[PDB]
Design a protein around this motif. Structure first.
Motif: not given
Lengths: 121, 49
Positions: A101-105
């Motif tokens: 989810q961090w990389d997707q943000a």
């Protein structure tokens, strides 16, 4: 090879020099130069001849002939200007990624930046 | 006074013709291969190779 064959057949009814042929992935485009200034009838005839010659090989083509701009998958030119579609979706994805989810943000912000540069703020 | 006979004139013109505007629309023009294009001195414009 296919566009060379089709242009060879199209030369039957018109005299022109093929300036460039480009095969860019999902699109093809060729620039044809004539000894006269291009007329409406010339454009329509070239379009119809290209379509019929492609059909001769059982290829279904929508042959779009212009004098000023083209529209391909990864860009389109109008009025001597270039445009890139800003259609990157932010809250929807094509398929589940293998990221966090961090990389997707991070990817969400990157897509937002790319869309903004392309005119979708 | 309006005299009908004295006021009759036989106006003469051409029976028909067609008028054209863009003469160069009738001219189809092409260029020789640029490698062989020559200058005023009969030599190729560019000879570098």
């Amino acid at each position: 090879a296919l566009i060379k064959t089709v242009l060879s057949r199209i030369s039957n009814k018109y005299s022109f020099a093929t300036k460039i042929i480009r095969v860019d992935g999902d699109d093809n485009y060729a620039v044809l130069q004539f000894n006269t200034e291009v007329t409406k009838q010339m454009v329509q005839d070239v379009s119809n001849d290209v379509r019929e010659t492609y059909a001769r090989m059982n290829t279904k083509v929508k042959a779009l002939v212009s004098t000023v701009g083209i529209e391909i998958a990864k860009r389109y030119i109008a009025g001597g200007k270039i445009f890139f579609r800003a259609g990157i979706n932010l809250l929807n994805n094509e398929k589940k990624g293998q990221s966090t989810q961090w990389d997707q943000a991070a990817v969400l912000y990157s897509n937002y930046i790319v869309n903004r540069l392309r005119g979708f703020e | 006074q309006f005299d009908f006979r004295a006021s009759m004139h036989m106006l003469t013109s051409n029976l028909t013709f067609t008028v054209y505007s863009d003469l160069l629309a009738f001219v189809s023009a092409d260029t020789v291969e640029p490698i062989n294009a020559v200058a005023f001195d009969n030599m190729r414009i560019m000879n570098e190779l």
